[PDB]
Nucleic acid binder design. Structure first.
Ligand SMILES: Nc1ncnc2c1ncn2[C@@H]1O[C@H](CSCC[C@H](N)C(=O)O)[C@@H](O)[C@H]1O
Lengths: 22, 38, 235
RNA sequence: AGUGGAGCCUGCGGCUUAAUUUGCACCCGGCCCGGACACGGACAGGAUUGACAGAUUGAUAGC
């Protein structure tokens, strides 16, 4: 008899240095 | 320096130069052969 | 304008030319990176010891590069002055004096690889009446196919002065059984264009109808975007 | 006589760049302005205009 199994049964830089000149 | 501001402390050793020497306006430039199989 | 037009290689390559060759920085630099390209152009496996031929060795700086990579080699040349300054250079490998077009005196199944630097272009022209470049090239290439291991590789660097030299060299190579091709390094360049012969041993329907009616000399509708265009489905 | 070798300069490519303009044009920051028509909102209880002083600003400025 088939069962109702719809879903799967298996579950160094300074302070002011800018980023440019760094 | 053209895009950003560089913040610098004026030291006594800095006594002769221009300010523009201490914010550089350009960035440093940081810059496979066929073998025959038949 | 070119060394080939000087004459036979035993006369253009005298002692004075040898001493100008050995004291020449551009010769050293270019022929060194040509030896590098020559050794990298045959797919001999890495970490595998191999035995090589270095023909047209002249100074042996190509041999010095081969010995730098750990590999051993046999030098063959026609000019005595070149072999004299090569032994004066204290090169590691063994040299031999002999014409390549007459034939290489080695037993078959011997060398894992062959490297020829600026030498095959000298066999394209005849500087003696007994000389014939076609048969000389055939003999030299058959001697390569003999003395090489079947399945080994041979790189053959050249600067062909025209396509006739390439035509004859390739014909004499392909009639000696050699399979391979041409690596033309930097093809469209000029100062780096270097030839390396590498070898080894094994709606339209309506358009047609309207062009028909145009050729036949009658009035035809102008050809537009709507020439062949399905007006509607047909039920 | 050379050039191709070397040093330097320059031209195309390519690479780095915010930009390295192109077959002052480029970049980074700051100003200035910028429809009527229709319909719906606010508007004399107030629409909106002008402004000294100080400040932000790289600087000044009722912009
Ligand atoms: N038919 C021939 N047989 C043998 N050697 C030949 C030859 N024709 C030319 N050669 C050799 O080809 C050489 C050209 S000079 C090559 C020098 C070498 N590539 C180096 O720089 O290390 C000369 O030494 C000349 O003797």
């Amino acid at each position: 008899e088939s069962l109702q199994a719809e879903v799967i049964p298996d579950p160094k830089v300074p302070k002011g240095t800018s980023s440019y000149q760094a | 320096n053209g895009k950003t501001f560089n913040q610098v402390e004026i030291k006594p050793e800095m006594i002769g130069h221009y300010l523009g020497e201490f914010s550089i306006t350009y960035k440093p430039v940081k810059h496979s052969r066929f073998i025959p199989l038949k | 304008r070119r060394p080939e037009h000087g004459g036979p290689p035993e006369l253009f390559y005298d002692e004075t030319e040898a001493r100008k060759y050995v004291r020449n920085s551009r010769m050293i630099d270019i022929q060194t990176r040509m030896a590098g390209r020559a050794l990298e152009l045959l797919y001999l496996p890495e970490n595998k010891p191999c035995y090589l031929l270095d023909i047209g060795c002249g100074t042996g700086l190509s041999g010095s590069y081969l010995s730098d990579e750990g590999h051993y080699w046999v030098g063959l040349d026609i000019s005595p002055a070149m072999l004299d300054e090569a032994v004066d250079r204290e090169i590691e490998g063994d040299l031999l004096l002999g014409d390549m077009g007459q034939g290489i005196p080695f037993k078959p199944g011997t060398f894992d690889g062959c490297i020829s630097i600026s030498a095959v272009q000298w066999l394209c022209n005849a500087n003696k009446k007994s000389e014939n470049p076609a048969k000389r090239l055939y003999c030299f290439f058959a001697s390569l196919f003999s003395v090489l291991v079947r399945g080994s590789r041979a790189v053959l660097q050249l600067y062909p002065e025209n396509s006739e030299q390439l035509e004859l060299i390739t014909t004499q190579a392909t009639k000696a059984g050699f399979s391979g091709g041409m690596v033309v390094d930097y093809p469209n360049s000029a100062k780096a264009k270097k030839f390396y012969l590498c070898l080894f041993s094994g709606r339209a329907w309506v358009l047609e109808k309207k062009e028909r009616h145009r050729r036949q000399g009658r009035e035809v509708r102008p050809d537009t975007q709507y020439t062949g265009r399905k007006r509607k489905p047909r039920f």
